[PDB]
Ligand binder design. Structure first.
Ligand SMILES: [K+]
Ligand SMILES: [K+]
Ligand SMILES: [K+]
Ligand SMILES: [K+]
Lengths: 82, 82, 82, 82
């Protein structure tokens, strides 16, 4: 799949994750964006995490939709810098 | 391996993880499902984790049986939406 | 690489990780084994982690020697159950 | 890509991550090196993490530039030990 398409896909995941965390868990846009990257990259510091059932469900959806997309995006980015 | 078979395998892992954590560590079904995803996806927030020796042994079994299965499931899911 | 050789390699990693965390960080053998799996699988709950400079150095060595070995072991294990 | 080149690339990531965390978040050089490995390997214990907006932005940059580089480095290292 074209690298630029994979870029748009991961940007869409990032918007989804960030807006979701912001509105569901109430954290700031900046913290939510950070939490989104930390989650889809599978880092998972745990400094931020969902504390509501809706947030937990949402996080599972983000995990399923976002980890693979992020992994593909990283590997494509590798091809370009490297 | 057929995508639908991989689906059944990851659903089986999810049931195993969720019921195990619920019964061993005593967390609610919802928290246990969430913890299962967070674990097999290798996110590992650490907001929930086992606090008993049996829970620790169980978590190691889940890690070994579940991380690979979830990884294959994600990559198969990639192909379908993408 | 033969699957059984990969098994021995990951067992060697597990022994190294467990003994090291036990002796350097002072946690029980059981906690240390659990921490080793949680680390080399890249889950990283953070319920346990090194609190000394030697422990931090050691953990970096385990990360480098163990994450790859564990990942290959998992994928070979997938071939056998699946 | 030649293994030695991948080695230089991951060393550059490690320097970037370590110096960045040290200067932005104020942790010691040793803690910062440890945090860098824990982050780019995707372990993410969360015993250390950024607490400023600049640190969060920086961490996202390190995650994008470093996780892929580390993954390739680990797999090349595997080829040599194994
Ligand atoms: K983690
Ligand atoms: K991970
Ligand atoms: K993790
Ligand atoms: K954590």
């Amino acid at each position: 799949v074209p690298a630029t398409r994979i870029l748009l896909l991961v940007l869409a995941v990032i918007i989804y994750g960030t807006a979701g965390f912001h509105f569901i868990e109430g954290e700031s846009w900046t913290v939510s964006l950070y939490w989104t990257f930390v989650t889809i990259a599978t880092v998972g510091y745990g400094d931020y995490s969902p504390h509501t059932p809706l947030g937990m469900y949402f996080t599972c959806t983000l995990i399923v939709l976002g980890i693979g997309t992020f992994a593909v995006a990283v590997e494509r980015l590798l091809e370009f810098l490297i």
